[PDB]
Every structure is written in structure tokens, then in C-alpha cells.
């Protein structure tokens, strides 16, 4: 194989770094123009989302490696911020060429990017120190879910989504805990609904319902019998499923399998519950018996969901039918089979007003692209919202923060006479590329457009108002309500600024060429 060093590597790193910053820059923000992306499979994905673009790209290099990696630490915690962290890393790398071309060693600038990465996140700190409680922040949660639902263009009237993300974060992730819960938030949805068909389910919706509507739709508080046990074909994991191969076998199994389920569905109710959640469902034969034995219960519960309805409800674990006991049961504040407004989306909810250990946002949509349109949008909302419901620290987005940063950055950059005097100043120059590439997408000349904000910063020297991010012509950060959590913007940088510098410290690469990923 081969070892490429210095300028070779220098042209190995920024090269693969430069192009993917470009696909996202015309994808950048709400005006970022979406990208249809098609697999070898005949697939089609219209993506302005970098992480989705990165999920769409298997493209090959340590950069393309780190890129698919870098955004998705921003996309879960903070959500929105996925796009800027990469494109700006390229812009930083875009600079380091000319800046090493000035004869400043890549590690001579390297600290200067991070050194001046301080002022930006430090300047972000200055923007809005506000932190609001759930019931107060819920408007800023949806006011940010104005923006953080905005980029996917599923936002207004989706204040449903915006509000269901308010409680979904609060329900499981506390405000004081500030340990991220996207794991105990259950992201859920189904095709055939509608974007405006939207709900936050507090407990667990199990997809299948009671074996009949001829038995009540409603199981009361708790009494959920947690069951791994066949009332339909078991398909056990220890042996293999086979069915009856003989004529006398359909005779006896029909007669045998009925009276046991008669006994067992009674034995469930003997052990007791108004709901038996079975990993292995009721058959249609066992359905009429759940009717005949006069018990409500769920037929099908997921193999994992038998843990879910156990944990997510806090319901005390009943492993199986043989472990059935009265004191151990799955729990509910109530149990319903809920039509969501489109009977196509129909679930049996085990709902938690007692303890929700998995809170379920249930989105709906005409199809899957539309619910995912909502969900990743709801995600980034739910993300920033959770960030904000932890600490409501916000910042006016669209770069007017960075336009205010870059000036203060490059100034405070010059203060250290060390060669990063200049190098940190060039760092600030990169802070201006995202609203730039946004102003491109906005239909505006970013050059003049930023200088409007520059002038506005010359006016303000912090973002309050700003330029367009959505394309309107009312140029505001505050009144347009272009606002991001103050956290993730700093996290964008922290993710954006070092990877460059980290790639700066690693130019020594054994490769025949870039494509090794």
C-alpha cells in the first residue's frame, strides 16, 4: 500500500471535505433546496437533511467517514444543527489551504481555529441566557418548534407535533435530570394518517386490539397480564414451528387447543387482569374464547414489547403464563383501543398516567415519507425542545449570531500576537459561510445580505433581528423567530471546529488514496 503525507494528505483531507459541504449548503436551512437522492435500488429520497444525506451517502473517505459520523451526534442530542457543523468544517478546511499556503503550518493555525472557536461559543453564551420551565418553555418549545419543525416544512398546525414534543420530553426526560431521553421517548407513527393527525401517547399503544370489539374496548387502571405464551402459533425459539400433518390432527388439536385456552384465558383471569398482553397472540379460535371466557385481552404483543409494556408502563414483570401471579402485573392508568381519526391507524393503547417509562409520540401521515417528514422534523424539534426543556438557552440563528461572533471573534483573534493572531481571524471568516450559503438558498446575494446583518451587528453587535432564513423579505432573527438552542450551536462548533483541527493533527495517513474510508 501507500503513505500520503503533508500537502498530499492536505489535498487528501479538505478535498473530500469540500464537496459534501456543498451538497448541504444548497440544502442548508429552510431555504436550503431539497435534494432528491436515489439509490441503486430505484429508491428516491428528497433530502435537505445532512444526516439523511449522510445516511444516503456511503461515499468513501475518512472525511466522508467522519462526516456521516459528525452530524449524527448533533442530530440526536440537539437535533437541528446537523447541517451547519459539517459545511462549516469544510469552510474551516477551505481556509487552512490558503492559510498554510501563506506558510502557516497546519498546526500553527490549528489551535487558532479552536482558540477562536472559544469566542464564538463564548459569544453564543452571551446571546440568550434564558431558561424556562416546561409550562413556560412550552411556547418557546413550540416557538422553537416553529423553527425546528420548520426546515422539513412540517411546522404550522403541526404545533400538535410541537406540543406533543413538549410533553414527550418532559414525561420521560425531566427538566432537572438533564440526562437525554430519546430512548424513553417512543417515536411512533403510521401511514394512512395525516400530518395534522397527531398525538402524544403517554403509555404504550399495542398495535393489535382485544380479540373482539364484542368485548369491552376498555381495560381499567393496571391489570395488564404480561405474557409470553401462545394462544396462537407459538413459533418458539428453542424448537421449530410445525403444524398438523394429518386429518385426525385437525380433529384433536381443534378440540384440544380450545378448552385449554378456555381454561387459560380463564386462568389468566384466574391469575387475574382485565388485560392479558401476550407475546404470542390469541388465535381467531382463541379470539372467540377470549370473548367466550368473557375476558378482555390483547392478542399480539411484540417480543420486545412484552418488555416494553412491562417497563414503559412500569408494570411489574410477569415473564410468561407459568409465572402468572396477582401482585405482578403490567400497569395502566387505563387501557383503550383508540381510533386515531383514521381507522387505518388503529392501536390498543395501554396509557400511563401512573408511570410513563416510554412516552409515545404517535404521528400520522398519508404515507411513510410524510410521517418521516414529520418525525425527523419532530425529532429535531423534540431534540431542541428537550434541550430547551432542560435549559432553554437559545440563540438567534441564521448566522446573525456568528456574524456577531465573527466580528468579535476576529477582533479577539488579533489580540493574541501569536501567529494565530491572523489565523484566528480567518477562523471568524468561516463563521460567516452558513448564513451565506443560507442567503444563497434564500434567493439573496449572501455577500451583501450578511453585510446587512453586519450592519445590523454594527447596529446591534448581537443578533436580535437579522436577515431571512425562511425566504420572505422580512429580515429578522427574533421576529422571524429564527432561533436555535444556545447549546447545540456551541455543540455545532465544538463538533465542527475540532474535527478540522483533529484532522489537522492527523495528516499522517497510510492509504493508497483518499477513498479508503
Amino acid at each position: 500500500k501507500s503513505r500520503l503525507m503533508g500537502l498530499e494528505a492536505l489535498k487528501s483531507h479538505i478535498m473530500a471535505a469540500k464537496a459534501v459541504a456543498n451538497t448541504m449548503r444548497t440544502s442548508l436551512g429552510p431555504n436550503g433546496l431539497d435534494k432528491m437522492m436515489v439509490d441503486k435500488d430505484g429508491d428516491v429520497t428528497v433530502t435537505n437533511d445532512g444526516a439523511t444525506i449522510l445516511s444516503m451517502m456511503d461515499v468513501d473517505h475518512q472525511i466522508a467517514k467522519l462526516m456521516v459520523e459528525l452530524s449524527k451526534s448533533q442530530d440526536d442530542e440537539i437535533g437541528d444543527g446537523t447541517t451547519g457543523v459539517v459545511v462549516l468544517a469544510g469552510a474551516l478546511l477551505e481556509e487552512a489551504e490558503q492559510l498554510l499556503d501563506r506558510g502557516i503550518h497546519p498546526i500553527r493555525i490549528a489551535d487558532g481555529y479552536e482558540q477562536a472557536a472559544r469566542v464564538a461559543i463564548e459569544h453564543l453564551d452571551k446571546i440568550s441566557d434564558s431558561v424556562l420551565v416546561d409550562i413556560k418553555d412550552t411556547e418557546p418549545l413550540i416557538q422553537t418548534a416553529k423553527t425546528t419543525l420548520g426546515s422539513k416544512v412540517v411546522n404550522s398546525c403541526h404545533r400538535q407535533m410541537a406540543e406533543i414534543a413538549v410533553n414527550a420530553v418532559l414525561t420521560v426526560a425531566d427538566m432537572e435530570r438533564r440526562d437525554v431521553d430519546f430512548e424513553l421517548i417512543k417515536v411512533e407513527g403510521k401511514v394512512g394518517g395525516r400530518l395534522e393527525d397527531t398525538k402524544l401517547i403517554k403509555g404504550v399503544i399495542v398495535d393489535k386490539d382485544f380479540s373482539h370489539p364484542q368485548m369491552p374496548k376498555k381495560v381499567e387502571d393496571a391489570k395488564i397480564a404480561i405474557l409470553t405464551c401462545p394462544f396462537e402459533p407459538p413459533k418458539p425459539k428453542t424448537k421449530h414451528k410445525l403444524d398438523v400433518t394429518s386429518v385426525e390432527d385437525y380433529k384433536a388439536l381443534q378440540k384440544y387447543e380450545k378448552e385449554k385456552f378456555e381454561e387459560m384465558i380463564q386462568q389468566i383471569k384466574e391469575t387475574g387482569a382485565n388485560l392479558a398482553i401476550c407475546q404470542w397472540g390469541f388465535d381467531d379460535e382463541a379470539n372467540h374464547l377470549l370473548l367466550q371466557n368473557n375476558l378482555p385481552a390483547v392478542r399480539w404483543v411484540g417480543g420486545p414489547e412484552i418488555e416494553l409494556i412491562a417497563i414503559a408502563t412500569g408494570g411489574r414483570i410477569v415473564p410468561r403464563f407459568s409465572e402468572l401471579t396477582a401482585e405482578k402485573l403490567g400497569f395502566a392508568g387505563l387501557v383503550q383501543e383508540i381510533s386515531f381519526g383514521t381507522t387505518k391507524d388503529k392501536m390498543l393503547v395501554i396509557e400511563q398516567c401512573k408511570n410513563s417509562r416510554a412516552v409515545t409520540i404517535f404521528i400520522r401521515g398519508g404515507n411513510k415519507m410524510i410521517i418521516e417528514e414529520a418525525k425527523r422534523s419532530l425529532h429535531d424539534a423534540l431534540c431542541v425542545i428537550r434541550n430547551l426543556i432542560r435549559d432553554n438557552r437559545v440563540v438567534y440563528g441564521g448566522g446573525a449570531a456568528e456574524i456577531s461572533c465573527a466580528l468579535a471573534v476576529s477582533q479577539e483573534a488579533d489580540k493574541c500576537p501569536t501567529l494565530e493572531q491572523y489565523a484566528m481571524r480567518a477562523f471568524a471568516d468561516a463563521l460567516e459561510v452558513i448564513p451565506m450559503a443560507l442567503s444563497e438558498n434564500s434567493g439573496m446575494n449572501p455577500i451583501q445580505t450578511m453585510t446587512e446583518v453586519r450592519a445590523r451587528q454594527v447596529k446591534e453587535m448581537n443578533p436580535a433581528l437579522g436577515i431571512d432564513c425562511l425566504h420572505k423579505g422580512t429580515n429578522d432573527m427574533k421576529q422571524q423567530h429564527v432561533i436555535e438552542t444556545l447549546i447545540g450551536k456551541k455543540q455545532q462548533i465544538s463538533l465542527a471546529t475540532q474535527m478540522v483541527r483533529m484532522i489537522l493533527k492527523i495528516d499522517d495517513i497510510r492509504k493508497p488514496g483518499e477513498s479508503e474510508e
Binding site: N22, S27, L33, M37, K40, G42, T45, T47, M56, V247
Partner: protein
């Protein structure tokens, strides 16, 4: 992954719908030209296609941008009807419009609202010359009739047009508040009739009577059966395998002939002379069922008695085991109607009721296929003509009016995007242009004059590009429900601005 940057992406955005649009813009518009599908990737074939999808889907759509419209234009056709050829050309028009504005170095975003807002005010100007024709039922008749004949047009239909413009409106004038595809029962076969079709009293069914069965059934009370017998009747004992060797292989066929006989026990219990079921029986079975003396009709159609039960006032049900799980159907006759050489067992309980059977007799399926869609398309445009009885002047006259207004608008309306609105307005008059030379006529004057001419208020007077002449859109009958035209405006305007805003395409 293959990264497609904007240079070819916008270009590929343009080529996809244009390269198919040119094919359908022949078919679409008035008729000076069509698509003759010359078919070989799959075969040796020669085909004549006015259908967009038959042009679209048969040919390779593999362009990711062509994927959009071939997917999106079909739905528009699958929704309101005749949207394949429409959403394709009209966005392909915009692709040309974008291309210049692209080549003019203009933000696609700047082009978005420029078209997208222009889409509205055109749909608004579309709503202007949209003229409600619901006045009387005779108006609503001839509205639907003009509209039914509107979608059927620019397509090859032999005897279809004049009969369904009766039927489609007949299906409308019975349901009153919608049209009936739930009622019209399309029955296709080889009758030797060219396109010739008719409203079928009751519903005919295709079987040869023979063996011992007398062919005609009189005073027939049908016993509705949702479950018949295939060959062996299915129940507890219904299956056996005795085969230990090659003799039994020939001897197992003989064992199941017994199972045909026990089927008689079930039907002889019900007692009704006429037993009509879903599942067919064969001629050697006909020996056992016909010698039983009761008349057991095989393959009696669900939608057929669904016709009856609606019109006869009775109940067609599901899950038939014993006679009363479905309310007994009442027909006047179970008869054999002989059409040419055909022998068709024909159930007549009612005539031309609010559920009709429609017998489509043709020697070719493709025409019967494209006849169904244009019928499937018209009734939808007729069912929305039940809702919106505005029939907006078609044949490009709508394009003109919208092109004139939006141009007038772009003049004042933006300070910049007057680029795209007129560009939008330009794409409007496009569809008119391609077909006038197809009559030999000069579109330029037309789109210049007759637009401004009828956008100065001749709006009824409009484009006959079959004759290449200026004629009245209402009197020529060239016009259609305000929805479908706006509906074919909705997707195509949306279809273009998607790949327009697409500046990169990943390819795995």
C-alpha cells in the same frame, strides 16, 4: 455513492419529464399527433398509445427525475383522471422555463414562488373562465356530457365515447351527488362487437350449459352463495393422500371425484332450485350436479348480485353457509343470452337500475383498457362536476387566460420574480403551441392573439387545434371541470419545483 451536482442535476431534472413529455404532448393537447408505441425491449410489437402511463411505464423511466412525474403524473391520473399526459408535459414545460431561468443564473428558490404564486393566480384566472354549468339537469347533463367527451378526447375510442357519455352521466344522474363506479359493472369478453357495449339489465355470466343440464332457467329465485365449490368441497374430511406408488398417483385423481358428490348434500339441504355461487364447477362435475335436478349456478358474480341487491332492494351478504346467512336474492329470470357465437347465462332481476352492468365487447383489450380509464377518468371528472359543475374552457384557452393574467400580474406583482410568473405564464401557452403546427396552424399568433383576443373577453372563443382554428370552447365542447384542470395544474406545478430545488442527487 454517486454524487450528482447541480450542473447535470438541474439538467437531468429538465431532461426527464421533457423526454417523456414530448411523447405525451403529442397525445395530449388537441390532436394533431400522438404516440405510436413501437415496442421492443420486451418483445416484437407495434402499439398505438394515447395513454400517458402506457407511454410512461412501458418505456424505461429510469431517470430519477422522470421517476418523479411518472410516479406523480400517474397518481394525478389515478386521482382525477387523465393526469399522466398532463402533469408530465406541464412540468416538462416548466423544466424548459426553469432551464432558461437556471441558465439565466437564478436561484431555484427565486423561481419557486415566481411559479408557485403564479400557479395560484392562474388557478384563479382558471376559476374565472371556469363557468358553473349545473343550472338545470339538462345543463348538468350536457355539462357532464361535454366534460365526459372532454377527457375521452385525444384518445382512440371506437364506439365508446357516445355510449359512456350517456352511461357516465347515467351513472351520475342516478346517484345524484356523485357518479357511479360502484354501480356500473364492466363485463369484458369476446363478443365480436367492435367496441359495441351496452347497459346490461341484470348481469350476464359466461358459461356453457351442457351435459344433462337444461340450459334456460325460468322463474328463478337465486340462492346467493359467497362460498361455492372449486372441485372438491372443503370441510373436515375434505383432503386425503393415499399414494404409496405410481399407481396411486393415477388412483388419487379417482378418489377426489367422490368429493364432488358430497357437495350435493349441502345444496339439496337448502332446497332452492336455483343455487348461485362464486366458485366454478367443471363439465364432468356438471353430470353430478345437473342430474341432481336442482340448478346450481357456478361463478355467480358478487358485484352481479351486488347490482341486484341494490336495485332489487334485497340483501347481498358475505359468509354463506346455510341459506339464510345471505338474504335470498330475487331475479325474474336466469336465462342464456346468445351474443353471436357466445353462450352467456344471464341473470335478469332488474333493468338499468341504479346499479348497472356494462357489457364491453371488443376484439382488443388495449382499447377496452384505454376505454375504461377515460371512463374511469370522466366519471371522476364528472363526480367532481357533480361537486364543481364549473367547466373551464380547455384546449389551451385556459392556458392563455392564465398566461395573459399572470403576465399582467408579473408585470406589477413582483419586483424580481416577474421572471418566473411570466415564465410560468409562458409554460401555459406552451401546451397550446405544440399542437397547432400539428394542425399546421401558427401558435404564435394564436398564443399572442387569441390569448389576448379571448383574454380581452372572447374566453368562450378558443383554440380548435384539431382544425387549427379559433372556435368557441363552450360550443366546440372543449372545456372540462375546473378541478381536473386545476388538479392537473397542481401536480405539474409541484412536480417541476421539486427537481427544480434539487441541486444534488446521490446514486448508490
Amino acid at each position: 455513492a454517486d454524487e450528482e451536482r447541480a450542473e447535470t442535476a438541474r439538467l437531468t431534472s429538465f431532461i426527464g419529464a421533457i423526454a417523456i413529455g414530448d411523447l405525451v404532448k403529442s397525445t395530449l393537447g388537441p390532436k394533431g399527433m400522438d404516440k405510436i408505441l413501437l415496442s421492443s425491449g420486451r418483445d416484437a410489437s407495434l402499439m398505438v398509445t394515447n395513454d400517458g402511463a402506457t407511454i410512461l411505464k412501458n418505456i424505461g423511466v429510469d431517470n430519477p427525475a422522470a421517476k418523479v412525474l411518472v410516479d406523480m403524473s400517474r397518481v394525478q391520473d389515478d386521482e382525477v383522471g387523465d393526469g399522466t399526459t398532463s402533469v408530465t408535459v406541464l412540468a416538462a414545460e416548466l423544466l424548459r422555463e426553469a432551464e432558461s431561468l437556471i441558465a439565466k443564473k437564478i436561484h431555484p428558490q427565486t423561481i419557486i414562488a415566481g411559479w408557485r404564486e403564479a400557479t395560484k393566480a392562474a388557478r384563479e384566472a382558471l376559476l374565472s373562465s371556469a363557468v358553473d354549468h349545473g343550472s338545470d339537469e339538462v345543463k348538468f347533463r350536457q355539462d357532464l356530457m361535454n366534460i365526459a367527451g372532454t377527457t375521452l378526447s385525444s384518445k382512440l375510442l371506437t364506439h365508446h365515447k357516445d355510449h359512456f357519455t350517456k352511461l357516465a352521466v347515467e351513472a351520475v344522474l342516478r346517484l345524484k351527488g356523485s357518479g357511479n363506479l360502484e354501480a356500473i359493472h364492466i363485463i369484458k369478453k369476446l363478443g365480436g362487437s367492435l367496441a359495441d357495449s351496452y347497459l346490461d339489465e341484470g348481469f350476464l355470466l359466461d358459461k356453457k350449459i351442457g351435459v344433462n343440464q337444461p340450459k334456460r332457467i325460468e322463474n328463478a329465485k337465486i340462492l346467493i352463495a359467497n362460498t361455492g365449490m372449486d372441485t372438491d368441497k372443503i370441510k373436515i374430511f375434505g383432503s386425503r393422500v393415499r399414494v404409496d406408488s405410481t399407481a396411486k398417483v393415477a388412483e388419487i385423481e379417482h378418489a377426489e371425484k367422490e368429493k364432488m358428490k358430497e357437495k350435493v348434500e349441502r345444496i339439496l339441504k337448502h332446497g332452492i332450485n336455483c343455487f348461485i355461487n362464486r366458485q366454478l364447477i367443471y363439465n364432468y362435475p356438471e353430470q353430478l350436479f345437473g342430474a341432481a335436478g336442482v340448478m346450481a349456478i357456478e361463478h355467480a358474480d358478487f358485484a352481479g348480485v351486488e347490482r341486484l341487491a341494490l336495485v332489487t332492494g334485497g340483501e347481498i351478504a358475505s359468509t354463506f353457509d346455510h341459506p339464510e346467512l345471505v338474504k335470498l336474492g330475487s331475479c325474474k329470470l336466469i336465462e342464456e343470452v346468445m351474443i353471436g357465437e357466445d353462450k352467456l347465462i344471464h341473470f335478469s332481476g332488474v333493468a338499468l337500475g341504479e346499479a348497472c352492468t356494462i357489457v364491453l365487447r371488443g376484439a382488443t383489450q388495449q382499447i377496452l383498457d384505454e376505454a375504461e380509464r377515460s371512463l374511469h377518468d370522466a366519471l371522476c371528472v364528472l363526480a367532481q362536476t357533480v361537486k364543481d359543475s364549473r367547466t373551464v374552457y380547455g384546449g389551451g384557452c385556459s392556458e392563455m387566460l392564465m398566461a395573459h393574467a399572470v403576465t399582467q400580474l408579473a408585470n406589477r406583482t413582483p419586483g424580481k420574480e416577474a421572471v418566473a410568473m411570466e415564465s410560468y405564464a409562458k409554460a401555459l401557452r406552451m401546451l397550446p403551441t405544440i399542437i397547432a403546427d400539428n394542425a399546421g396552424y401558427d401558435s404564435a399568433d394564436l398564443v399572442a392573439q387569441l390569448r389576448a383576443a379571448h383574454s380581452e373577453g372572447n374566453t368562450t372563443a378558443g383554440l380548435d387545434m384539431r382544425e387549427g382554428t379559433i372556435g368557441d370552447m363552450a360550443i366546440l365542447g372543449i372545456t372540462e371541470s375546473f378541478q381536473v384542470k386545476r388538479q392537473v395544474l397542481l401536480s405539474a406545478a409541484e412536480a417541476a419545483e421539486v427537481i427544480l430545488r434539487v441541486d444534488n442527487i446521490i446514486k448508490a
